[PDB]
């Protein structure tokens, strides 16, 4: 008679209660349609079991002494050229390797305790041709490589539901990046140089802002007369806004203060606050005027629909 | 004064009501942060408008005479090397082309009336390196190509929520295919030859069926004594089941009939129905016995959990 033992990788092994003619315990398990058999010094279900299919391909199940991992190998009829290998741990992490006709690594799937995973594809040269990475927060990264193993393309989805397409030049350097936010506003970077500089544009509902990219930050600029509004976006997506006016008259010169907590730029002329520009979480801009004391806001905040309207607010 | 005209691709053009000094109508539109201007013989908003950015890159908007399509071209400062081209029709279909630094096609996105689309990526050689196709029923196909423009990989999702991974050999012939159904049962084909033949396995809950693949069909086989059960799956997923017994005694010989409408194989021995094997929509097998007249089913249908149980039913 036998005991059934649960193993990592949703497998079972049957161990004899009594040892055999040689002092060993007899093992049986079923993989695919095939009964594997083996023997072990231990009676806990650990050991090696093997079988041979009708096509003479071979299956080997290796169960570690503490039942902490299983290895399942499938071989061609020569007994040494791998078809597949699956290593599964007690902690539910596993590596699955797939081999091509030659017995060389063709694809590899890795899953982890956290439920994250990686899929890798390999070419005729045994080099990594594509990789898809899923993390536990739902986010993912897909990478395509070229004959030199440099990036040709990359697509990233995030938890915030943004997506990014990245294209790379012949040398594997980022050349273009296209970010689509969940709300459908976009950032687009073109002509990106080896140092991470290039041209930038932010696509908002009803208008576009233009500017430049450095490795440090994105700077989008709006000029009207002598005033220059600059909207800065760090690599991490943190917005900060500034204003400079070359007007030297204390009567007409605009200055401003940025409040990071309220995402609000407050414009001042001649010692009095004149308006608040709010840079909202919906990726809109609203403008609202202060009263003649520069002390309280009047009327209601007005959502900007056009770049001319931003320019108007800077006059 | 001007009239505003709605165009394909969510654009607007302002046309003068009155013609100009040369008998032409003046056109204005805004693309990105840039005011484009032009003139036309017509007063409907059709014609060509152009602008030059602060970096001397150029934008050209071509609006057809019947307002049936727009073409928006972005050029480098030379005025001829494309950065991007977007052709948009009245029927909401559009082609978006992206060019690399050299002015060569790097990526192309096509969307259609039906809301289906294709994304294409091109390599340094101007050859198709990857393609993603989304159809209107939600289904999609992703293809990766090699340096010879033959397939290296393909991933397909369907409306029925099945997925398929396909791997290809050095010559671009299918070598492996792994089908995962929505219920988590699987078909796996290995060692696929140029004629579409190879090894097959169906992964069911609790057991695996093995067999072979031809271009015609998948045949999974279960043998017990002199009886052979064959489960056939066409390329389209249509199941049919047959049984043959080499037993020559009319007293013990099994035969069977397949009912495609009820997905049921009915076994007969000695002129009496003995059991129904149902091949269910959940990709399970149930067995149920007939009474001693072979006329009505007795007890209840029992879900098979193991290959040994199928073999038992064939004894």
Instruction: Answer whether A19's CB lies under 8 Å from A12's CB.
Output: no
Taking the Cβ of residue B88 and every Cβ of chain A, the question of whether any pair is shorter than 8 Å is answered with no
- Pair B175, B151: CB distance under 8 Å: no
Tokens of A74: 């499938």
Residue tagged 């390797």 (tokens): A97
- CA-closest candidate to residue A122, choices B154, B167, B189: B167
Q: Is A195 helix (H, G, I), strand (E, B) or coil?
A: coil
B153 touching chain A per CB within 8 A: yes
DSSP A309: H
Are A108 and A123 within 8 A, CB to CB?
Answer: no
Report phi then psi at A80, rounded to 5: -135, -20
B195 touches chain A (CB under 8 A): no
Q: State CA A67 to chain mean position distance.
A: 34
Min Cα distance A117 → chain B (Å) is 16
Q: Hey, which residues does A62 pair with through a beta bridge?
A: A48, A71
- Is A146 in contact with A125 (CB distance < 8 Å)? no
Rounded CA separation B256/B254 (Å): 7
Q: What are phi and psi of A197, to 5 degrees?
A: -80, 155
Inter-residue contact A167 to A146 (CB < 8 Å): no
Query: How distant, in Å, are the alpha carbons of A3, A11, A37, B77 from that of A44?
Result: 9, 14, 15, 75
C-alpha distances (whole Å) from A148 to each of A121, A145, A172 are 15, 8, 9
> Is A220 within 8 Å of A211 (Cβ atoms)?
yes
How many Å lie between the alpha carbon of A100 and the closest alpha carbon of chain B?
Answer: 8
Q: Cα-flanking dihedrals φ and ψ of residue B272, to 5°?
A: -120, 130
Task: Tell me the Cα Rg of chain A.
Answer: 32
Domain boundaries, chain A: 1-315
Gap between the Cα atoms of B276 and B238, Å rounded: 19
B83 CB near a chain A CB, below 8 Å? Answer: yes
Most distant pair of Cα atoms in chain A: their distance: 106
Cβ(B254)–Cβ(B227) below 8 Å: yes
SS3 content of chain A, % helix, strand, coil (to 5): 0, 55, 40
Q: What is the resolution of this structure in A?
A: 2.1
Which whole-number Å values give the CA distances from A202 to A168, A186, A205, A221, A313, in the listed order? 21, 6, 10, 10, 19
CA gap B180, B204 in Å, rounded: 11
Write out the DSSP string of A102-130.
Answer: TS-EEEEEEE-TTS-EEEEEE-TTS-EEE
Question: Using CA atoms, how far apart are residues A86 and A10, in angstroms rounded to an integer?
Answer: 12
How far is the C-alpha of A185 from the C-alpha of A176, rounded, in Å? Answer: 17
Cα gap A157→B180, rounded to integer Å: 23
Give the tokens for residue B132.
């993603």
3-state secondary structure of A66: coil
Contact partners, residue B233, CB within 8 Å, separation at least 6: B187, B202, B217, B218, B220, B239
Whether A219 contacts A200, CB under 8 Å: yes
**DSSP 8-state assignment for residue B94:** E
Structural biology method used: X-ray
List all residues of chain A from 168 to 187 with a beta carbon under 8 Å from chain B. Answer: 169-170, 175-176
Closest-CA residue of A relative to B55 is A199
Q: Indicate yes or no: CB of B100 within 8 angstroms of CB of A167.
A: yes
- Cα distance from N-terminal residue to C-terminal residue, chain B: 93
Choose the closest CB to A106 out of B121, B129, B167: B167
CA–CA gap between residue A275 and residue A254 (Å, rounded): 11
Task: Tally the residues of chain B.
Answer: 315
CB within 8 Å of B236: residues ≥ 6 apart: none
Encoded tokens for A208: 């576009």
Closest approach of A33 to chain B, Cα-based (Å) = 6
Give the number of other CB atoms < 10 A from CB of residue A239: 16
**B residues 256-285 lying closer than 8 A (beta carbon) to A:** none
Rounded alpha-carbon distances, angstroms, from residue B249 to B225, B289, B314: 14, 22, 16
Coil/strand/helix, residue A22: coil
| CB of A105 less than 8 A from some CB of B | no
CA distances from B129 to A181, B83, B155 (A): 26, 20, 15
User: What Å distances lie between residue A145 and A148, A171, A176, CA to CA?
Assistant: 8, 11, 16
Q: How far is A184 from chain B (nearest CA, A)?
A: 14
């Amino acid at each position: 008679n036998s005991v059934s033992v649960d193993l990592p990788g949703s497998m079972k092994v049957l161990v004899s209660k009594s040892s055999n003619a040689d002092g060993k315990y007899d093992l049986i398990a079923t993989v695919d349609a095939l009964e594997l058999s083996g023997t072990s010094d231990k009676n806990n279900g650990s050991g090696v079991l093997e079988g041979v299919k009708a096509d003479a391909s071979k299956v080997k199940l290796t169960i570690s002494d503490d039942l902490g991992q299983t290895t399942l190998e499938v071989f061609k009829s020569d007994g040494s050229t791998l078809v597949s290998k699956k290593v599964t741990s007690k902690d539910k992490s596993s590596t699955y390797e797939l081999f091509n006709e030659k017995g060389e690594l063709s694809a590899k799937y890795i899953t982890r305790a956290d439920k994250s995973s990686t899929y890798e594809l390999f070419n005729e040269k045994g080099e990594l041709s594509a990789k898809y990475i899923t993390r536990a927060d739902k986010s993912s990264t897909y990478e395509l490589f070229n004959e030199k193993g440099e990036l040709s393309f990359k697509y990233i989805t995030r938890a915030d539901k943004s997506s990014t397409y990245e294209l790379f030049n012949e040398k594997g350097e980022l050349s273009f990046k296209y970010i689509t936010r969940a709300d459908g506003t976009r950032l687009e970077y073109t002509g990106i140089k080896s140092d991470g500089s290039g041209k930038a544009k932010e696509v908002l509902k009803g208008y576009v802002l233009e500017g430049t990219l450095t490795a440090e930050k994105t700077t989008l600029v709006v000029k009207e007369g002598t005033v220059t509004l600059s909207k800065n976006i760090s690599k991490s997506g943190e917005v900060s806004v500034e204003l400079n006016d070359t007007d030297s008259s204390a009567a007409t010169k605009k200055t401003a203060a940025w409040n990071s907590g309220t995402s609000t730029l407050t414009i001042t002329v001649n010692s009095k606050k004149t308006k608040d520009l709010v840079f909202t979480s919906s990726n809109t801009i609203t403008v609202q005027q202060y009263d003649s004391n520069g002390t309280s806001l009047e009327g209601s905040a007005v959502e900007i629909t056009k770049l001319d309207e931003i320019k108007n607010a800077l006059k």
